[PDB]
Amino acid sequence: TPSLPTPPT
Amino acid sequence: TPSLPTPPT
Amino acid sequence: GAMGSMERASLIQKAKLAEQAERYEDMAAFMKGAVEKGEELSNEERNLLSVAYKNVVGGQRAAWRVLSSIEQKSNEEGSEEKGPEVREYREKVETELQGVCDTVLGLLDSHLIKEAGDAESRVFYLKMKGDYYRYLAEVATGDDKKRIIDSARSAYQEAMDISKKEMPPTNPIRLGLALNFSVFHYEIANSPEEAISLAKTTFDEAMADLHTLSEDSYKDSTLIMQLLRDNLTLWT
Amino acid sequence: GAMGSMERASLIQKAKLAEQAERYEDMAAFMKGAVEKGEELSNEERNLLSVAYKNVVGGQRAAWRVLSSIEQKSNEEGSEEKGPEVREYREKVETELQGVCDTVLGLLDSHLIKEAGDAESRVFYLKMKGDYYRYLAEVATGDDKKRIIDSARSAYQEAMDISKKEMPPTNPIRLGLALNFSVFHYEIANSPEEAISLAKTTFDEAMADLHTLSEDSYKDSTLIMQLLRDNLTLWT
Numbered sequence: 076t077p078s079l080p081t082p083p084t
Numbered sequence: 085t086p087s088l089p090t091p092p093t
Numbered sequence: 094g095a096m097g098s099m100e101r102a103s104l105i106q107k108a109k110l111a112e113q114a115e116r117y118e119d120m121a122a123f124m125k126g127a128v129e130k131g132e133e134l135s136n137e138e139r140n141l142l143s144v145a146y147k148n149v150v151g152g153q154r155a156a157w158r159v160l161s162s163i164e165q166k167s168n169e170e171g172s173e174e175k176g177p178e179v180r181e182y183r184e185k186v187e188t189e190l191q192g193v194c195d196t197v198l199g200l201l202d203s204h205l206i207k208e209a210g211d212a213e214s215r216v217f218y219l220k221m222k223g224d225y226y227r228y229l230a231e232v233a234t235g236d237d238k239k240r241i242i243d244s245a246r247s248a249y250q251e252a253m254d255i256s257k258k259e260m261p262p263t264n265p266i267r268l269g270l271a272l273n274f275s276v277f278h279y280e281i282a283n284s285p286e287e288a289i290s291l292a293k294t295t296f297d298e299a300m301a302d303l304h305t306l307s308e309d310s311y312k313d314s315t316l317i318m319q320l321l322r323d324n325l326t327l328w329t
Numbered sequence: 330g331a332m333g334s335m336e337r338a339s340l341i342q343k344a345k346l347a348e349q350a351e352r353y354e355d356m357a358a359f360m361k362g363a364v365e366k367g368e369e370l371s372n373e374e375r376n377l378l379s380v381a382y383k384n385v386v387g388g389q390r391a392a393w394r395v396l397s398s399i400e401q402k403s404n405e406e407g408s409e410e411k412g413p414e415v416r417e418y419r420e421k422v423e424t425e426l427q428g429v430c431d432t433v434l435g436l437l438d439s440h441l442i443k444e445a446g447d448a449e450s451r452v453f454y455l456k457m458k459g460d461y462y463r464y465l466a467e468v469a470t471g472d473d474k475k476r477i478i479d480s481a482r483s484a485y486q487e488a489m490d491i492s493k494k495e496m497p498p499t500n501p502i503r504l505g506l507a508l509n510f511s512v513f514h515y516e517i518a519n520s521p522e523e524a525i526s527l528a529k530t531t532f533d534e535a536m537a538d539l540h541t542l543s544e545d546s547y548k549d550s551t552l553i554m555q556l557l558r559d560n561l562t563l564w565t
């Protein structure tokens with residue numbers, strides 16, 4: 076399952 | 085300019 | 094440590110450059126150096142620490158899963174023996190992943206969590222603690238495996254308790270914590286019903302609070318709500 | 330070296346696993362270990378060496394270009410002074426890139442090129458030599474810069490001379506060499522007309538030989554021909 080993604084700051 | 089790409093072996 | 098001679102502000106500046114350059118191992122090393130200066134982190138600095146390490150460990154986890162799949166295939170009936178190499182290399186990647194998780198956990202324990210008194214900082218770090226124990230649980234098999242899973246659960250639970258008391262139901266950190274703890278329930282703790290219940294209740298309670306938000310806050314909260322809904326769709 | 334205790338066959342096996350895992354630094358270290366066993370490389374092993382290092386250096390070059398652009402912007406009129414950090418970090422990435430290029434060049438010199446007698450191996454390694462000197466030229470500024478550019482030119486030229494004598498005009502290595510040497514002319518040597526002439530002649534001579542090829546060979550040759558045409562389209 077997908078967890079929280081990590082977009083650029 | 086693009087040079088030769090590196091596809092998977 | 095190798096960043097001991099660099100100014101805190103310079104380490105933060107270089108972390109931001111490393112992010113732009115997609116140099117996440119460098120980013121993580123700069124942020125580790127910044128934490129080791131001993132001062133508390135601002136909101137922005139906490140996000141840089143998290144981005145750096147999530148990118149590093151994410152790459153390691155993806156590699157580990159590829160190797161573990163190959164290793165699984167090798168142990169099926171009919172498979173030709175190819176020697177110890179797949180196990181050895183999976184083990185190498187696993188040890189490196191464990192090392193990074195231990196490093197992040199070590200920063201949290203020395204001394205980020207103990208100095209974090211505001212809900213936004215404390216919840217953020219306890220969420221991180223749960224996540225990196227969850228990554229350790231994904232690769233665990235030995236005598237301490239139950240303890241690793243329980244350490245992730247305990248961290249997430251403390252984060253949840255504080256977030257429910259101290260943060261609105263739309264707070265992005267609260268939402269992301271709930272998302273990740275639901276994934277823990279589903280993927281690690283063999284508790285799909287708890288996962289589903291938590292995602293549903295979190296979504297519903299956030300929906301009900303959206304009316305209080307600015308346009309900008311709404312965007313961030315609704316993005317994470319959609320991620321909760323995506324998982325609910327997958328799980329049901 | 331740290332791979333000295335691992336069997337050659339195991340290093341090759343692990344290089345292939347590392348590729349699947351997208352672990353290109355590991356892949357390169359395994360292939361370096363395999364070259365250092367002292368035996369010549371097969372066609373497949375040469376391709377693994379090349380893939381590993383092109384992925385590593387490609388990531389470093391992309392990072393360097395991002396940092397060099399930021400550094401350039403900083404030196405424009407109107408730009409606020411932000412201290413030495415951007416230059417320092419560009420320099421760090423540059424030094425690491427130079428190190429990898431020097432490592433690859435060192436493998437070629439000790440002793441891959443001198444033992445390569447067949448055209449497919451020798452042209453392949455001289456093409457590599459030209460490419461890694463070209464990457465060094467991209468970041469060079471000092472007293473040896475002209476010499477670095479001339480070292481790339483000399484390697485490419487020797488490769489071209491052998492390929493023209495010994496390989497058909499559709500050979501993929503010959504084609505890729507011509508593509509990269511044309512890029513050298515355009516991007517490094519300030520010779521766009523030579524770049525265009527080489528790409529055109531290479532394309533035309535390959536076209537004329539396609540009739541001799543199997544379906545499978547045709548696919549590979551036409552792919553690289555299209556890359557030559559793409560550059561011609563960009564340059565004209």
Ligand SMILES: *Cc1ccc(S(=O)(=O)N2CCNc3ccccc32)cc1
Binds near residue numbers: 140313
């Ligand atoms: C754990 C957590 C939760 C939210 C945030 S954020 O700063 O709002 N942010 C960046 C990380 N991922 C993310 C996804 C969607 C929307 C916002 C974010 C940071 C960390």
Ligand SMILES: *Cc1ccc(S(=O)(=O)N2CCNc3ccccc32)cc1
Binds near residue numbers: 088089504505
């Ligand atoms: C330099 C060179 C030229 C061709 C080849 S290949 O093995 O035919 N190959 C893999 C590398 N890139 C590539 C692009 C298009 C078509 C074939 C290839 C290898 C190396």
